[PDB]
Swiss-Prot record, chain A:
Residues 836-860 are annotated as: Activation loop. Changing residue 939 to P: Found in T-prolymphocytic leukemia; uncertain significance. It is found in: Nucleus; Cytoplasmic vesicle; Cytoplasm, Cytoskeleton, Microtubule organizing center, Centrosome; Peroxisome matrix. It comes from Homo sapiens (Human). The chain holds residues 1962 to 3056 of 3056 of the full protein. Changing residue 839 to V: In T-prolymphocytic leukemia. Residues 816-824 are annotated as: Catalytic loop. This is Serine-protein kinase ATM. Changing residue 980 to Q: Abolished interaction with PEX5 and translocation to peroxisomes in response to reactive oxygen species (ROS).
Length: 989, 580
């Protein structure tokens, strides 16, 4: 490619033949690679309708379309394959069908019986358990053998006879390039299950449960899964049941425990729900139905059919049956499965939430009845109870939110009603029901004081009841904030605040204190609890607590908070540590921060901070050091700080400051004044929470992507606490290397300055930009590639980097990101990764820019960097879709403290600030050349823009992302947007 | 029910046992009725997962789920039926599959071969045209017979031998409660097509086109349709092509005209698009592809694959191929199919609208190029030109609307920008680009004056170019109203107002006059045109015109309008009727 590119470059300079076939082959190599977006959308470029269309449809997981394609692929050769595909499709699709396809497999020709028989064996390995053994007129064949061989003994032998015969395939397997090794490993992992069997033919059932529990442990082990991979694993794990039914029919409890197997199968179906694939997931029920899970007294079977709520994609076929259960089962409810029933009721309520159909009162009956079923109420139940009290909250929250909307949203209506509050007359007319309207407004409050009250408890209850909603708690917290200082049930919430898993509760901290030091019965009481919380992992609590004052403290309005910070300092006095010498050290750091001016790598940190004031001797120490626990307080110290810290140049310059911990690990620290951290910072916490949310997406784990989080600290109101870590983008300097490097002989940064000298104008700028583009050739693909080595890495890391490049790249428009530059965003090939560093800009602050513009805004070279190919959205979007999906997934919870986010006392950043945002932070001092409600409204607008962002388009189209991506792509695309740029991204010029 | 209700009422007053089974039976009677919502959601109440779930899934048109259900319906008896269902599903679903299901129909048991063979015949009646005739080892069976009998002659006899043998079913049909009589009538209407054949075995091709055109007329006749019903109708109408391919391979133009048949098939696929059902609609392409509509120089075949834009539900697999066409075909474009190509370009623009992806400028290239392809430009084309100028309007309208939004919606942003209009200082700061912002606002206007202007013409052009957007015209009118009294291109629109199909233009009337009597160059000029329009079907125009004053007139502010109403009354004087 580079060769072709160079060749192209040469050909340009001059200004599989054409090798898109090679690219296809490379795609085929990308296929040979088999990397899913690199397969899918990064494999995108290949002009399918070849069977590539099928292969695409095959790349597509979707049997039917493929099956249709496979059907359409009657046109194509390898119809045997297409049949096998169809088989796979049938495998994907269905069974008696496949039996009919086994009938379809009559088929008269024996060659790919090598598949087909094995597939017939796989069909045995599917079904007709000992029957298809009779039908035997390969792993499957082995299984098929093993199948009857199961009916035994020397299956164990035969298993071995397969086992390495399998491993033979593994032996046969070569070049080590991918998983599906995994599938083999699965086919292996299969064998293990198969192997695992033999105890049974030997074999109590109680023990066997452990094996199920082991199979479950294996399933737990299989928490890492690919349904495709997992399919057999279950299928076997299921198929395990087959004679495990047959023989263990003998033992009733065993025949019973098949229920647990069914339950497992159900769980498998639950996993199928997880797999988010219909067919066996249905058939499972059928199987379950087919099973003695036909029997269905308590219909935990059907309780599974809560699958069918979305498993029939439509509920209410099901939800009716659920309702039927939720009647009949509730009627059947009319022992501990009562919890399940309650859970069912919760599920019913959930399904009723899923209903989103009858009165909240219906829920506030049925779900409140489900809540009464919750009142019908292990930790799982508690989790369920959380899941309930959460749903209970959530539902009430919904109602409350609806109420909140109906309050606040319909406050505008209530304004429209306040427009009618006394409308203008007749005293018999205007004045009367305003009392009721007040009572309504009271009811409106009382609705919150119903719902918001109830949920809060439920939230609290759920919050108490366990983990994983914590963001929604942060919303409930955000609610509790709206409640905080109000709604003395907040004090009751404070009274409920006994239940705080402060360890859980911790995250709020950066926000949490924002008001902590007004309302005594709340904020102080909260602050009290906060302090109480602060005590918990006070080490964790420290820096905010440290920041709490030290944000504003100076050795050279609502500071009652700062007073409360002293009152905290009393709690901090109550901390024996008196480690606040650290704060003094921070002040010494602030002094160090105060210190200032010979540009260079700079020795002589000595004068300041008492030369690191005993060199950061070990203490309640190791500041930067992000981790914390519920157990937290077993830690490391700071024990050295290397002085003479080479000055990191900057407007507020740092020194690269590496303080060697108790570990002596010396983390080069980013410290510069005139600096507000939390404004940047909690965005990280958000991004962290996002990453957590990302983490919260195993889909993101499936994406295997994440967010890049700077660890900084809120040192001073005007300064400073961070770690300047690694390898960041001096991309332009990298260009200044690489522009000087392979991009040598293109057009200067001066020409770019000449481009920057195009700042006058406007379409000419596009032309200029076009010229600038013509003047430039984003080599950055070549760039980190050069940085790259280990062509694995230089692919994979490159991919990873690309993935990395993509990885946050999604977040930005979602994020409402800051400025373009290798300064205004960074990347460490040190990290072999890109952490965009600005964290300046509010979501729309960039839109609020004079010379605003919009995109995730990777430049061409940044694209070229982002990927040297692929319309990398083809991956990146395909990746970033998940983000949107996750975003879409998270949206409400996403909003949740995201709501709280701009609600901060610190949130003037979230206000996209003034001084023209410091002259747009002196928007390069303009190239060194040239309403809280409204904020809330803007925030609402943001929230709208968020609601726009979160499932909305400009059209409200929202056109999940790929359109928005296409939009983003468009947003990325525009030479106009390019023309729309200013120096920071006119850098990108 | 009332009895039960009365019984209930009585039981209340007192205050299929329980007969929801009866209700189910009544549903089954509603089924016996067969009225779709009365079937479907009004049939809703019956507690399915019986095969009712299937029957529901069967009520559901959706093969796969049903097929899945049918698959799940391996559980159920009448698996033969479920198979037949599967067959129907396969019929709904697919073919080599059904062939595989014909393989699946190996199946060892002959009873519902009475279906299956007939279905195999229906599979013949599906496919393996003279081949499944060989596979014969019923309407379909008749067809299957007719199939080879087509290979002839006494098929015509055999047809009769079916024809009333069919009508026998009709005779057998009794109680007259529903269509599907229609399906029989279709199965009959089928026969007609089958009957219609015989001229061919006798048979020019030019004439035959009329029969296609007749089949099209029939299709026009089939404008009333149920895809379910229509399915065979097409399928036959398609299947008609089968030997119509085979024999008429002999005559090249005939072999060619199979393109028109393909075109018909394509139209059938278009109808399939209309049917809004994927499978054969795909297979059609495959068939088309399988056809000499494999050949694909101008890819009107692919121009159909604009199906695949949503026919692959996702475009851009296709739209890429479309783009590929819209490159390659546009490259191939680089004769009158140029209109189609333009239409394609329009479609491309439409697909580009469907893209909703790159710059409006991209459209304002590509679609404007499509508009240039529109400029590349019968009445259909004019309709297309409308469809273009409409899309052209619509796209611009979108842009203009976007502009309108970006104007008016972003007027709030422009208010947020007016908040920055002079923000508060530095005279080097606050004052500068407001001029550009004005120029932007100008550009914003100029955007409308690009888009709103362009669309308006396109709207006008489309408005001129024909019917059926008229509401969108009413929007363009509504736009023209925003334009009215403004945007002297409105006067140019008035100048364009020459094109008014006032008869079309009529509907606005109740609104239309609302301002008609301010801006002379517009409202009056409009009122003039309105009057001019009013002259058109002045009888229609009358009462509003009558109302125009008589709303307010009393024998016991902007009445310049009422004056204009008198000025209209002058035009009404210009009406000799003096019917006033």
């Amino acid at each position: 490619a580079d060769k072709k590119s160079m060749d192209d470059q040469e050909k340009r300079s001059l200004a599989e033949e054409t090798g898109i076939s090679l690219q296809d082959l490379l795609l085929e190599i990308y296929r040979s690679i088999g990397e899913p977006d690199s397969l899918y959308g990064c494999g995108g470029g290949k002009m399918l309708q070849p069977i590539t269309r099928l292969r695409t449809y095959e790349h597509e997981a979707m049997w039917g379309k493929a099956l249709v394609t496979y059907d359409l692929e009657t046109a194509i050769p390898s119809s045997t394959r297409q049949a096998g595909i169809i088989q796979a499709l049938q495998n994907l699709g269905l069974c008696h069908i496949l039996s009919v396809y086994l009938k379809g497999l009559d088929y008269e020709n024996k060659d790919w019986c090598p598949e087909l028989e094995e597939l017939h064996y796989q069909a045995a390995w599917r079904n007709m358990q000992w029957d298809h053994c009779t039908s035997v007129s390969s792993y499957h064949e082995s299984l098929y053998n093993a199948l009857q061989s199961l009916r035994d003994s020397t299956f164990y032998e035969s298993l071995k006879y397969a086992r390495v015969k399998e491993v033979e395939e593994m032996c046969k397997r070569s070049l080590e390039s991918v998983y599906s090794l995994y599938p083999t490993l699965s086919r292996l992992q299969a064998i293990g299950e198969l192997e695992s069997i033999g105890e049974l033919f030997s074999r109590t059932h109680r023990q066997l449960s452990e094996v199920y529990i082991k199979w479950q442990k294996h399933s737990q082990l299989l928490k890492d899964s690919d349904f495709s991979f997992q399919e057999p694993i279950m299928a076997l794990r299921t198929v395990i049941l087959e004679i495990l039914m047959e023989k263990e029919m003998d033992n009733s409890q065993r025949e019973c425990i098949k229920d647990i197997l069914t339950k497992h199968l159900v769980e498998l179906s639950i996993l199928a729900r997880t797999f988010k694939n219909t067919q066996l997931p249905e058939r499972a029920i059928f199987q379950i139905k087919q099973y003695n899970s036909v029997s269905c007294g308590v219909s935990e079977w059907q309780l599974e059919e809560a699958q069918v709520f979305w498993a029939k994609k439509e509920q209410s076929l099901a939800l009716s049956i659920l309702k039927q259960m939720i009647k009949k089962l509730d009627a059947s409810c009319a022992p501990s499965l009562k919890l399940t029933y309650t859970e069912c009721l919760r599920v019913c309520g959930n399904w009723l939430a899923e209903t989103c159909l009858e009165n909240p009162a219906v829920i506030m009956q049925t779900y409140l009845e489900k809540a009464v079923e919750v009142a019908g109420n292990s930790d799982e139940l508690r989790n369920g109870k959380m899941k309930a009290f959460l749903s209970l909250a959530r539902f009430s929250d919904t109602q409350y939110q609806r109420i909140e909307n109906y309050m606040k949203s319909s406050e505008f209506e209530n304004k429209q009603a306040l427009l009618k509050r006394a409308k203008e007359r007749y005293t018999v007319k205007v004045q009367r029901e305003l009392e009721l309207d007040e009572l309504a407004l009271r009811a409106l409050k009382e609705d919150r004081k119903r719902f918001l009250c109830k949920a809060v408890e439920n939230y609290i209850n759920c919050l108490l009841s366990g983990e994983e909603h914590d963001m929604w708690v942060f919303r409930l917290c955000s609610l509790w904030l709206e409640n905080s200082g109000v709604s003395e049930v907040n004090g009751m919430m404070k009274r409920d605040g006994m239940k705080i898993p402060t360890y859980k509760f911790l995250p709020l901290m950066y926000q949490l204190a924002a008001r902590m030091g007004g309302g005594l019965g709340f904020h102080e009481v909260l602050n009290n609890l906060i302090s109480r919380i602060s005590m918990d992992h006070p080490h964790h609590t420290l820096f905010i607590i440290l920041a709490l004052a030290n944000a504003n403290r100076d050795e050279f309005d609502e500071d009652r908070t700062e007073a409360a910070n002293r009152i905290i300092c009393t709690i901090r006095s109550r901390r024996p540590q008196m480690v606040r010498s650290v704060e003094a050290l921070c002040d010494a750091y602030i002094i160090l921060a105060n210190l200032d001016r010979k540009g260079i790598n700079i020795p002589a940190d000595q004068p300041i901070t008492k030369l690191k004031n005993l060199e950061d001797v070990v203490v309640p120490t190791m500041e930067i050091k992000v981790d914390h626990t519920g157990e937290y307080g077993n830690l490391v110290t700071i024990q050295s700080f290397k002085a003479e810290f080479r000055l990191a140049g900057g407007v507020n310059l740092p020194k690269i400051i590496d303080c060697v911990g108790s570990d002596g690990k010396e983390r080069r620290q980013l410290v510069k004044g005139r600096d507000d951290l939390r404004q940047d910072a909690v965005m990280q916490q958000v991004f962290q929470m996002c990453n957590t949310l990302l983490q919260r997406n195993t889909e993101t784990r499936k994406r295997k992507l994440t967010i890049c989080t700077y660890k900084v600290v809120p040192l001073s109101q005007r300064s400073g606490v961070l770690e300047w870590c690694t390898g960041t983008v001096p991309i332009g300097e990298f260009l200044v290397n690489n522009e000087d490097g392979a991009h040598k002989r293109y057009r200067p940064n001066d020409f770019s300055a000449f481009q920057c000298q195009k700042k006058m104008m406007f379409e000419e700028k596009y032309e200029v930009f076009m010229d600038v583009c013509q003047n430039f050739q984003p080599v950055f693909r070549y760039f980190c590639m050069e940085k790259f080595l280990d062509p694995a890495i230089w692919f994979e890391k490159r991919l990873a980097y690309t993935r990395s490049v993509a990885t946050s790249s999604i977040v930005g428009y979602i994020l409402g990101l800051g400025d373009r530059h290798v300064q205004n965003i960074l990347i460490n090939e040190q990290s072999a990764e890109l952490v965009h560093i600005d964290l300046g800009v509010a979501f729309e602050q960039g839109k609020i820019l004079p010379t605003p513009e919009t995109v995730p805004f990777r430049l061409t070279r940044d694209i070229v960097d982002g990927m040297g190919i692929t319309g990398v959205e083809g991956v990146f979007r395909r990746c970033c879709e998940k983000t949107m999906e996750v975003m879409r997934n998270s949206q409400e919870t996403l909003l949740t403290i995201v709501e709280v986010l701009l609600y901060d006392p610190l949130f003037d950043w979230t206000m996209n600030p003034l001084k023209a945002l410091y002259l747009q932070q002196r928007p390069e001092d303009e190239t060194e050349l040239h309403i809280d409600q409204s904020f809330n409204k803007v925030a609402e607008r943001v929230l709208m823009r968020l609601q726009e962002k979160l499932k909305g388009v400009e059209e409200g189209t929202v056109l999940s992302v790929g359109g928005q991506v296409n939009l983003l792509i468009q947003q990325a695309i525009d030479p106009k947007n390019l023309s729309r740029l200013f120096p920071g991204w006119k850098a990108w010029v």
